[PDB]
Design a binder for this molecule. Structure first.
Ligand SMILES: CCCCCCCCCCCC(=O)O
Ligand SMILES: CCCCCCCCCCCC(=O)O
Ligand SMILES: [Ca+2]
Ligand SMILES: [Ca+2]
Ligand SMILES: [Ca+2]
Ligand SMILES: [Ca+2]
Ligand SMILES: [Ca+2]
Lengths: 236, 48, 296, 97, 236, 296, 49
């Protein structure tokens, strides 16, 4: 009664039979803004179910050579579903997320995927492009996973909301994160509160013959969505 | 921005063009912090 | 009158769930006596980090331990007890000859990412709120103490920045200025947490412009206006030449510290200021390397 | 409240007094744009004239809402209706009413 | 204290100095759906301020020969603002409206405009096109105003939520209408609960010299907006 | 715990404001005595229909009236007292010779917009909920009462519709059928309000397909499936020829009526069924015309 | 035209929310403003001139 689990938000439901439990970012659930932490004088919009639902976006293929990938939440979801609209129509944004990275295989396969969250995920390279800093859907790929393309050791990434997908045990990870920023609200069109990294620490291996197509899908869901500063529709 | 919802309707015998004056101020919930010298004006020549 | 859905909906909870409480911890945990134990169903050692939790296994359940009274205090491993230590973060040069700072004045940009030592520590967290105390060590390139007078003036972002060794901006009728001789001890200054943001931001994953973000404008990615405290100006109080080659070093200490999100330490050598850019052509291992994992 | 110089284009020194006023003729089309300006007080924009604006120059940061009253000086017989909009930060200058 | 008035919804505010009061459609204010009148088992979305706000759309020019125009509410607003999105993303729709047709002039002008609401506004002609039945923005024009292009006398239209804009007295009309349909919800993409008609009963006249440009603008605002059946985005 | 905004928000009121109450009214209002009145500030007569309200001026404030006790009942001006009257709405023809209805059977579509008289009244409102009572008058084109036997069968939408005078569908094991002789009195039938919609819809301003709505498909604009009650079938109970020329006329009466939104009466001549299309080439005035507005 | 600053409040203009202004107004006071050293005089006692 610890491996099986179900997630129900909006009009979406997720299932699992090899889950390794749920982790709550820094032990805190997504809460709305207090009437003292906010400065935006105007009742925001809490569409709820229409935006606070599960969205299955991108999928990648794990290989015996894959380096790793990453995404930028605030931006990623935009342009898709009712959520994207509010993010583009409104100026101020606020919300927490429920991430579910699923990746199954057979009992004859082996591999270990580290799935962690990194707040204010800045990258280096002498300045990365917009297609690298905000690769919304379909994300981007790591070139130097050892330094997370930022100059920091990945061996010390577990110091953040993380979880592992060791094929020999579980087949999916689940994280819950509350809004994070030195401000009550902030436009997600140009600022990403954090990013998701998926890196194979244990190279996916398996004897020839077993289906080599090992996909890794990403499914997330907004929580306690609040938008303010209603204006014209914007894209970036 | 300011737009014409309808049109500047005028009878026969009144100015075909008028003017408007804008007055600005801050609300009660207004508050300033810190401070510095003004950059809105700078003296070119020294006081005589 | 109520659709019931509106009554149930918890939407609007400014109260965070928490589920984790901070408790007192002056002395490290004290170990207790532990005897042998042989039974099924109890697997203290067996864990599954695949969940994302640090093994909660305790010494006792591993070996027959004794009793120990940990008197070891944990007061020096606190935020203030750590960050609250003066360190080099700035350095201005007002030489007589050269192209760097002629005219006799100098406008330094308020940023501390210019020096390793300090930058390493601070970049450990994502956010940080606090006050600071700055000390100013003025001296010549040799260590020579000269009888010269200077004027340090703070120029907030949006305030008139001095353009010459005698610019009108030095009247400092509003701005805060400090006059000191190189013979008198260094300047002692206390600075409050000033920022539109509730806490300084070390890493800004976004653009401050909100425009097109063209390639030529990728020079903005990471630039957060909430860390822009304006500039710092200094010059000799005179109409003529300084007569002396000077070099001011700015030291800072933090008071009333409040750190938040923690991130991995720095792995590579810093290259630019306010830029996590690294030496891509030559990356080095986090630590020392060996000859074999089976040999010391 | 102090006079806001929206129409700050003229600088003839003989026409510096019309910087305070504002033009509003009898257009013909649907959805004409009459004026546009920055919403920042301490900015070098039109808010330079306003007392509030000049004060800000002595402070680095601020907070609060802002009121701006518009008074029609035209003849009494002059009638009309206009839409005064405020596009929050992030929204580019609208091209359509 | 009966001619002056102000309407404030969402982040929009309307003004007037010659209003003739407000009329409430069949004496009933826009209410949400009861938990017994609804059959759609799923908590709908009440975005409120983000959609329940004033929208100034089309404008027309009144002339000494103009016949009249009309619009189809459910459809009209779609494709515009946050409202349009919910209408296109969701299947079921529900809402009431606050209409404000403004048209000023000078005390030397004369004219009388009838502004009424007509539920389930069907039209004839042997079958009108989609560009005539659902002329959303910019509406459509009446060819035979005497029979309302439906075969019914206009002389009997006052039997519905109406109001007059007699230039010699008022300069704008205002109506409030609650959801109307033999069902709790219904997709506005293909069905219009009603339509707005603006017909000059007293020909606009004025001696030469006075500004002949007499515009008539339309401004409406949703009320108690509720959307259900969240799905893919649809247009028609 | 509450953002206050959530507490205030009235969003979720299933309760309609109303502001208008229905009161008893058996007898028309009774007039009361009224004397003269000459004063300023009181303008009963002066109104402003520009608001959209029917002048509330009463006789008394207009002329020195007397007292009258209105005994006149308003029971015949009610919904039931009005609509509840049998009327022609259907008419089927099963002749011996011809191309219309050979074979001996006939499938009539359930729609009443085929006859003026009835259609005029009903199209006065927008919505209408109710039960009805149908009567069937079967007879030959002359008025000849023939000793023939028939079978009226109701075919709900989605049920097998008879294809021949002897189609299997006439077994009517589930569907409701009625067998009557032309010698026996007409058929008496009670029909309940059957419809997915809470009330029948006279005017449907939309499309039932939800597709592209191409021109060739403009044949759907106005078609509401909530008014589609299926079809009505009738035939002679035999394997051979009918032997007689028959014509059935369907009459309907409404019971337990509930009308809602009221709309303008019909101005033009009806052309199509379930189509408000009118005679555009030749439109006539709502009523009679005169020679001069100053002459009778 | 009367000479008074519009007393219109945010609430009567748009559907506002609730906010607790903690922003202090102690730095916008007289002393907190003027009480700052500044150049007002300057004398010159040169050898030659
Ligand atoms: C008055 C002393 C205030 C100290 C604040 C220093 C903040 C510097 C951080 C620079 C980071 C950046 O610019 O992106
Ligand atoms: C069983 C008798 C039921 C009577 C319902 C008659 C409804 C006919 C309305 C037809 C309107 C239309 O099809 O658009
Ligand atoms: Ca993809
Ligand atoms: Ca993007
Ligand atoms: Ca004129
Ligand atoms: Ca138009
Ligand atoms: Ca349309």
């Amino acid at each position: 009664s610890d491996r099986v689990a179900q997630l129900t938000i909006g009009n979406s439901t997720i299932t699992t039979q090899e889950a390794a439990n749920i982790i709550v970012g820094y032990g805190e659930w997504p809460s709305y803004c207090s009437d003292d932490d906010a400065t935006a004088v105007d009742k925001p919009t809490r569409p709820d179910v229409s935006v606070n639902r599960f969205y299955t976006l991108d999928t990648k293929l794990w290989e015996k050579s894959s380096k790793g990938w990453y995404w930028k939440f605030p931006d990623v979801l935009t342009e898709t579903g009712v959520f994207g609209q509010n993010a583009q129509f409104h100026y101020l944004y606020r919300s927490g997320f429920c991430i579910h990275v699923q990746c199954n295989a057979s009992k004859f396969h082996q591999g270990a995927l580290l799935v962690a969250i990194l707040p204010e995920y800045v990258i280096g390279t002498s300045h990365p492009p917009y297609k690298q800093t905000q690769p919304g859907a379909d994300g981007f790929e790591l070139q130097h996973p050892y330094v997370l393309d930022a100059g920091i050791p990945i061996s010390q990434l577990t110091v953040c909301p993380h979880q592992w997908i060791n094929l020999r045990t579980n087949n999916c990870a689940t994280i819950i994160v509350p809004y994070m920023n030195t401000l009550p609200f902030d436009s997600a069109l140009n600022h990403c509160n954090f990013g998701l990294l998926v890196v194979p620490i244990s190279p996916l291996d398996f004897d020839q013959g077993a289906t080599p197509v090992i996909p890794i899908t990403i499914t997330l869901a907004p929580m306690c969505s609040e938008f303010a500063g209603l204006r014209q529709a914007v894209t970036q | 921005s300011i737009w014409y919802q309808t049109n500047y309707v005028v009878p026969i015998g009144a100015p075909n063009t008028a003017y408007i004056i804008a007055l600005a101020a801050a609300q009660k919930n207004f508050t300033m912090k810190l401070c510095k010298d003004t950059s809105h004006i700078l003296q070119t020549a020294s006081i005589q | 009158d109520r659709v019931a859905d509106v009554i149930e909906s918890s939407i609007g909870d400014s109260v965070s769930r928490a589920l984790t409480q901070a408790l007192p911890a002056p002395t490290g945990q004290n170990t207790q006596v532990s005897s042998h134990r042989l039974d099924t169903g109890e697997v203290p050692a067996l864990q599954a980090a695949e969940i994302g939790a640090s093994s909660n296994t305790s010494d006792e359940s591993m070996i027959e331990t004794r009793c120990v009274l940990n008197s070891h205090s944990t007061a020096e491993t606190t935020l203030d007890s750590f960050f609250s230590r003066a360190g080099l973060v700035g350095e201005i040069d007002l030489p007589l000859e050269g192209t760097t700072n002629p005219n006799g004045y100098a406008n330094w940009d308020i940023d501390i990412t210019g020096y390793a030592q300090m930058r390493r520590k601070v970049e450990l967290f994502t956010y940080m709120r606090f006050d600071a105390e700055f000390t100013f060590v003025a001296c010549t390139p040799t260590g020579q103490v000269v009888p010269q007078l200077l004027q340090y003036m703070f120029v907030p972002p949006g305030a008139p920045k001095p353009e010459s060794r005698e610019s009108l901006a030095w009247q400092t009728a509003t701005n805060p200025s400090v006059f000191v001789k190189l013979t008198d001890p260094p300047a002692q200054v206390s600075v409050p947490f000033m920022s539109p943001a509730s806490a300084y931001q070390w890493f800004y994953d976004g653009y401050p412009t909100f425009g097109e973000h063209k390639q030529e404008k990728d020079l903005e990615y990471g630039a957060c206006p909430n860390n822009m405290m304006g500039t710092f100006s200094v010059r000799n109080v005179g109409s003529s030449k300084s007569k002396y080659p000077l070099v001011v070093r700015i030291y800072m200490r933090m008071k009333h510290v409040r750190a938040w999100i923690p991130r991995p330490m720095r792995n590579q050598n810093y290259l630019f200021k306010a830029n996590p850019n690294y030496a891509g052509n030559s990356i080095k291992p986090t630590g020392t390397s060996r000859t074999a994992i089976t040999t010391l | 409240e102090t006079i806001l110089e929206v129409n700050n284009v003229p600088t003839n020194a003989t026409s510096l007094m019309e910087r305070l006023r504002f033009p509003v003729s009898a257009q013909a089309g649907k959805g004409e744009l009459c004026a546009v300006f920055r919403a920042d007080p301490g900015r070098d924009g039109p808010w330079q004239s306003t007392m509030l604006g000049q004060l800000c120059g002595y402070y680095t940061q601020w907070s609060g809402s802002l009121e701006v009253t518009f008074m029609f000086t035209g003849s009494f017989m002059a009638t009309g209706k206009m839409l005064i909009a405020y596009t929050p930060p992030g929204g580019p200058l609208p091209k359509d009413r």
